[PDB]
Design a protein around this ligand. Structure first.
Ligand SMILES: COc1cc(C(=O)N2CC[C@@H](O)[C@@H](N)C2)cc2nc(-c3cc4cccnc4n3CC3CC3)n(C)c12
Ligand SMILES: COc1cc(C(=O)N2CC[C@@H](O)[C@@H](N)C2)cc2nc(-c3cc4cccnc4n3CC3CC3)n(C)c12
Ligand SMILES: [Ca+2]
Ligand SMILES: [Ca+2]
Ligand SMILES: [Ca+2]
Ligand SMILES: [Ca+2]
Lengths: 554, 554
């Protein structure tokens, strides 16, 4: 914020003083007993026997507008000063309004500052990009021996792109000033009062190689001498943070439902109309969003912009929750992995894991799901809205809850009932000593993740509801749903779309969810076998959190 | 920290309870109006109408040592428990002593916890590696249906290596359990009381791809069933932080001096004996150190373990200093770069810049040095010990301080003096209007870095001493020392080794440094031209900071 001016009695020196910067006066370097200083009314002097600082009232109308005299004894030293205004303004307040300490630090929190960029993936496009403005109030003859340059570091040049508005708020594809080939650009700025606009976009999300910060700097160069290299008289910069990709949980109000089978769509359209949300007809993707003060856009990841564990079916997120003081307003991303690494065990690709962490707003949690033949966490866990407590309920698949249901059917006298209507008897399933040992192991696997979710999400038992579900053993001792899993249901607010288990099973599940004020409608064919993968029924785009991610302190 | 035990009236269940973990008791899942519980004296129960937790007094001597009865009404439910002790202990206290919340988080600061590893670059080698111990107090027949496994994540397996002490504190190269090919390893542990030692080393320094954390986890597996996959009953882990490479400034007391010319070595040996430190005779390197509670080793980087801007001559570090509240106990690393990126400008390789930042203890500062033909920061800045103020003085090269010296020689009547004894007259140098414009530009470049160092290091003018130094212009308008630069001197405590400028110049420099209690001895040939580079004279290994880097909060 400081500049040092060294004056000398032999020759009057010229200097530029940018409004908003502390200007220091050097005296003893070229001086003698005492000194006295008299200046112009437009120059403020505050400090005499032999530190002096200068403050400008306003901008200059001509070169050498103001002056300062240094009397030492008595020989006088002259100083012709030029006060100019240079300010690179952006949305540092995050209130959607552009405003001109510290300016070189991006800070999390409500009492913090720092602008936000959106990832890109005509005025129509300009409504997405961020806006920074440059204000210059200089003498009319100032830029004959001075020049400004906007620049970004070579490491961040490919992560960002800056445009210059040619006519008003419009621009062409040739008006680029900063990009993955142009680390810097010389600005053509006229004398007098002039404000030019810049439109900035991000080219990449935060990652393990890119923390998510982009600094754009303006520099004032002195070009009064042809023989000597350019001299930096002043530098100002604004720090941009690239907005993270944020996942939305089932507790967030739905907006649009997608589906892809005959009697299936009828029950879906019924539920969508009851919850009053859009449904369009035309599983390996996740529909999140990016949020900026000016605009908020839906983003879909898969491969409205855009092993067996690398899928996004293994990607889930919890409702807002507070864990041991630490608050997670956007919830926590949940995904599956093995307990310990081995040659036969699999894990999510490290690139995908690190990407989730880069978006610090939803601190990921490694769960145990390697036991499942598919391996996705949504096979044994889910979330539903609740009127009381923390406002939600964690749904876990439970072989014990289902075995208790069957064992009482024998007690009631309904042990002759058959399912899958190859069909099998309920008495045979209960008497099946082999199946009981399998579900006992499956129960154990879920019980581990149960305590994991109770710990990392800070949950009590009064926040968990066990959904009766049976599991069998596929090849390589892997687990698999015995019947269509209820837990992987479709949540549309207070209107559920639980898969039909093929009823006594349906009767119990409702008794667990209906007291929460939930409407249970079962679907004949939620899941369909594609020949050799099982595909999910639908997909939902839900309303982004009211909580602004930048106000969070990871 | 929790495990859930589900008991049932139909069959008594067996369970393992690790000492130090909260054990929860599940009742209502297989129950009825009221319940009452009576247990063994070795089992503590705290909660009856229809949450219960169990606490173990000590470790078991046999399987099913303790028992718990659940009476519900009246049908009783039995529970055979096995209390075992499993603790993976390391130097979490950083006091050099191994001791058994939170255990999964490494925290900076004096009131923080977390172990430290050293980078590797026989008991002799064992004195460097870190030590973690595992304590197991189990029944004699415990590991017939249980097994332990030590493991590290696949992303951190190549950053770490763990050994197992075969005989006492000795080990062979075959006793490796964890490495860049072994993510996990099955531990052979006998029943009863048993403690085995592990020796751990780091394979890589903190970097942009490796933040510097390594987690080692022990897992308890239940292998009572052959048909069913292994079941994780318990997990415990310790987090290791890889110690960063730390630079030492001239203010730190020297220990050993290296040199590589006839009359040169005599003046060096004189200075080394006066400062009382070792000197061995046998410039493109930097001698830092890594620090652990148990051992501290010197590390040299170049290419006692181990463009023109990519050198380490451009690498310097400041004394301990506090900047705007923020405290930097190990100082700040200084290096050179351009003001703004261009096609003709150069910068330090991004890999090297990011590496310096990874070692967070000395937050790097980008300075302007692109103007120099060489480009190193040590050409125009240096640090010396001081009795008062912040305990040091910043030495900056100053063309103005040197021009003031010459102009007074004309005033005194000594304007006929010649240097380089092609030789040149001092009057001709002063009358040289071309040289004055060059140094005026060079002065401007240093004045920029002057305010940069006053800002980032929080320095006042009373901490800076201008050393008289002239600069000329090499090809491509680059700057170069007119005469041997004084500022790039050899600091050995309160004994300096300033280069001889070829005296009136020497007389002034001493008057600036001697009041600081510094002894000034000048050297005839400090710098030597090698045909086409200039090489530094000597190099110093200085004492590491008393301040422990792990107590710092970056
Ligand atoms: C592969 O195993 C599964 C995963 C998921 C799940 O929840 N998935 C799927 C994978 C990813 O998409 C996750 N994100 C979500 C649901 C499943 N339902 C069943 C199932 C079992 C069954 C038995 C008889 C009749 N019908 C039965 N069905 C349903 C019917 C298709 C056959 N199985 C075997 C499922
Ligand atoms: C290349 O320019 C330089 C760099 C450094 C420096 O400080 N360096 C060197 C580079 C890196 O090692 C940095 N880390 C440290 C010191 C220098 N002294 C002189 C110099 C100029 C001169 C003129 C006449 C007689 N002698 C003269 N000398 C000394 C004598 C060798 C000729 N020049 C030109 C220097
Ligand atoms: Ca767009
Ligand atoms: Ca999903
Ligand atoms: Ca060693
Ligand atoms: Ca150096």
């Amino acid at each position: 914020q400081g500049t040092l001016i060294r004056v000398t009695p032999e020759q009057p020196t010229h200097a530029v003083c940018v409004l908003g910067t502390l200007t220091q006066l050097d005296i003893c370097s070229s001086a003698c007993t005492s000194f006295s200083i008299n200046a112009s009314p437009g120059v403020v002097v505050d400090i005499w026997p032999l530190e002096v600082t200068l403050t400008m009232k306003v901008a200059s109308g001509s070169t050498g507008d103001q002056k300062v005299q240094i009397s030492y004894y008595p020989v006088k030293a002259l100083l012709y000063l030029t006060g100019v205004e240079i300010s690179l303004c952006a949305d540092i307040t995050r209130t959607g309004k552009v405003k001109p300490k510290d300016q070189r630090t991006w800070t999390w929190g409500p009492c913090g500052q720092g602008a936000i960029l959106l990832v890109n993936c005509d005025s129509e496009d300009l409504q997405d990009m961020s806006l920074m403005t440059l204000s210059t109030k200089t003498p009319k003859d100032f830029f004959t021996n001075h020049t400004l340059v906007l620049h970004v570091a070579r490491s961040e040049m490919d992560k960002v792109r800056v445009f210059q508005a040619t006519r008003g708020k419009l621009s062409s594809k040739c008006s680029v000033v900063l990009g993955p080939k142009w680390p810097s650009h010389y600005l053509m700025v006229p004398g007098g009062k002039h404000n030019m606009d810049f439109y900035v976009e991000a080219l990449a999300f935060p990652d393990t190689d890119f923390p998510g910060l982009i600094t754009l700097t303006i520099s004032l160069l002195d070009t009064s001498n042809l023989e000597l290299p350019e001299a930096v008289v002043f530098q100002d910069s604004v720090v941009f943070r690239v907005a993270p990709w944020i996942m939305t949980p089932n507790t967030q109000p739905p907006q649009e439902v997608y589906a892809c089978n005959e009697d299936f769509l009828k029950s879906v359209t019924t539920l969508a109309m009851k919850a009053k949300c859009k449904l369009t007809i035309c599983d390996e993707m996740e529909i999140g969003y990016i949020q900026a003060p000016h605009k908020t856009l839906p983003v879909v990841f898969d491969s409205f912009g855009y092993s067996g564990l690398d899928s996004f079916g293994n990607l889930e997120v919890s409702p807002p929750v507070t864990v041991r003081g630490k608050e997670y307003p956007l919830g926590r991303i949940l995904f599956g992995d093995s307990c310990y690494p081995s040659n036969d065990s699999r894990q999510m690709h490290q690139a995908l894991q690190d990407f989730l962490s880069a978006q610090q707003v939803q601190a990921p949690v490694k769960l145990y799901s390697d036991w499942l033949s598919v391996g996705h966490v949504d096979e044994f866990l889910s979330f539903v809205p609740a009127p009381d407590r923390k406002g939600f309920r964690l749904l876990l698949a439970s072989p014990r809850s289902c075995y208790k249901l069957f064992q009482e059917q024998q007690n009631e006298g309904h042990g002759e009932a058959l399912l899958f209507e190859k069909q099998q008897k309920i008495k045979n399933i209960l008497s099946n000593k082999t199946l009981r040992e399998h579900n006992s192991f499956v129960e154990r696997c879920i019980d581990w993740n149960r305590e994991l979710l109770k710990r990392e999400l800070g949950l009590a038992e009064s926040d968990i509801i066990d959904i009766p579900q049976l599991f069998k053993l596929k090849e390589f001792s892997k687990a698999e749903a015995f019947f269509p899993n209820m837990v992987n249901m479709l949540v549309l607010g207070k209107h559920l779309g639980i898969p039909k288990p093929f009823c006594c099973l349906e009767e119990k599940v409702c008794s667990l969810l209906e007291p929460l004020g939930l409407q249970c409608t079962f679907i004949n064919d939620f899941f369909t076998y594609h020949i050799g993968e099982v595909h999910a029924g639908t997909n939902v785009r839900r309303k982004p959190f009211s909580f602004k991610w930048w106000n969070m302190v990871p």
